[PDB]
């Protein structure tokens, strides 16, 4: 079983003498409004020995009991702050598939090393003190943290269309018509600059004897070389607390589970931030659908989300900031089709077509049948 081995690994990891907390308590007061600034001011000045003590967090002017909930809320706020693309540190891999990754443009700051070391320290603190963030990175990020080789298939998680194009280049013979050469054009703040994968790379075409090297160089540049300094600083900050001999007993999925807990899709947010076409919030089908979603397992909810929207990943701020294939599009439910037809989906429009069934049991059966071919999580 996956859970038993993961639990054994977690117990063995936390049983090591190199990850044992002390007895003294460290206070950490941060204003709720200015969480990021105070967090960076305090954390980025602590010492390694100090950070290994028990963590006690008190929001200013908010005195209360159950410090565990307070600490969890603080970590949630900090994770949604530092990893927010609007802060120009991380960025979604694609607008229609929200996967966080280190932003190449982040080098434009005068000193990104301090901020990325702070991010590494925050991740190490979350792992060390059994607290969960709520972000969802791409698998290549986790493979980089564990120092695993990155190959072509790893581009599938980052961007699907890019991987399909690379696979097409691999399979079909590349002709001279395609003006492809060893150079990548990157547009950074208006100005576009050229980066050469190999020396004098902008004057060499990709024949049938070189396309393998071209694919290797493109994959390495897209996944690794574009984020060397920033990820090196981040991993230094992370390994400042957690020795790398400890992280190297997991894989690209168990580390994700350890960092972000058991991933789940909230239903209250889903219901609050949806819209209907030809349907009203008081209609029987809508309330039956919401009840079914309420009493469903996380895997099946993820499968339905991927079937309807097109992906199982959500933006950093829930369903509110949900982007379609053209612009911001919220989860839409529409009355389309005949009774016998199964509930259909329009992925590029984030739309779900549920015909007006008669009984909730029939709705549940049809909805479960119509999503079986889709795999979630």
């Amino acid at each position: 079983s996956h859970m038993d081995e993961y639990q054994r690994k977690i117990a063995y990891m936390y049983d090591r003498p190199e990850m044992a907390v002390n007895d003294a308590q460290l206070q950490l007061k941060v204003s709720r409004a200015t969480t990021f600034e105070d967090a960076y001011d305090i954390i980025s000045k602590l010492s390694v020995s100090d950070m290994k003590k028990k963590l006690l967090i008190r929001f200013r002017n908010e005195d209360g009991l159950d410090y565990g909930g307070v600490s969890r809320e603080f970590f949630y706020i900090l994770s949604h702050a530092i990893f927010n693309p609007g802060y120009s540190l991380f960025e979604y891999a694609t607008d229609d598939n929200y996967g966080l990754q280190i932003s190449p443009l982040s080098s434009v700051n005068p000193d990104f090393r301090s901020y990325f070391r702070f991010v590494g320290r925050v991740m190490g603190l979350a792992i060390y003190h059994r607290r969960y963030l709520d972000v969802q990175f791409v698998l290549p990020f986790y493979k980089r943290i564990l120092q695993k080789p990155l190959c072509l298939e790893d581009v599938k998680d980052v961007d699907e269309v890019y991987y399909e194009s690379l696979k097409w280049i691999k399979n079909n013979d590349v002709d001279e018509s395609l003006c492809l050469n060893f150079s990548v054009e990157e547009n950074r703040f208006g100005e576009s600059v050229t980066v050469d994968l190999i020396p004098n790379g902008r004057n060499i075409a990709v024949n049938n004897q070189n396309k393998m090297n071209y694919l290797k160089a493109l994959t390495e540049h897209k996944l690794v070389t574009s984020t060397e300094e920033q990820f090196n600083a981040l991993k230094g900050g992370l390994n400042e607390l957690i020795p790398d001999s400890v992280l190297q007993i997991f894989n690209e999925n168990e580390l994700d589970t350890l960092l972000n807990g058991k991933r789940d899709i909230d239903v209250q947010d889903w219901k609050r931030f949806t819209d209907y076409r030809s349907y009203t919030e008081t209609d029987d089908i809508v309330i039956w659908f919401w009840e079914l979603l309420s009493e469903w397992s996380p895997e099946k909810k993820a499968k339905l989300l991927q079937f309807a929207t097109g992906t199982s990943r959500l933006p950093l701020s829930g369903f509110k900031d949900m982007h379609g294939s053209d612009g911001p599009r919220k989860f839409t439910i529409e009355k389309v089709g005949h009774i016998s037809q199964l509930p259909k989906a329009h992925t590029c429009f984030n739309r779900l077509d549920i015909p007006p069934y008669n009984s909730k049991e029939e709705l549940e059966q049809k909805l479960t049948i119509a999503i079986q071919e889709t795999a979630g999580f």
Partner: protein
Amino acid sequence: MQIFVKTLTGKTITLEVESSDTIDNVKSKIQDKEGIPPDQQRLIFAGKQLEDGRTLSDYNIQKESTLHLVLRLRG
């Protein structure tokens, strides 16, 4: 005659068919060789998608014709 069908995975399948063979018969052959249900098979020849109830001769399929097997669209 003989025809070739190339999938989206790059796989090439050789089928012993006839110009008078129906699209349903060729889809049944593809299902036998690969297990893909005929309803899920999307065959394209010369830019035209083969439809059930017709024949290869309706699509001007000739000796050693090359077809493309694609999957269903989403939206």
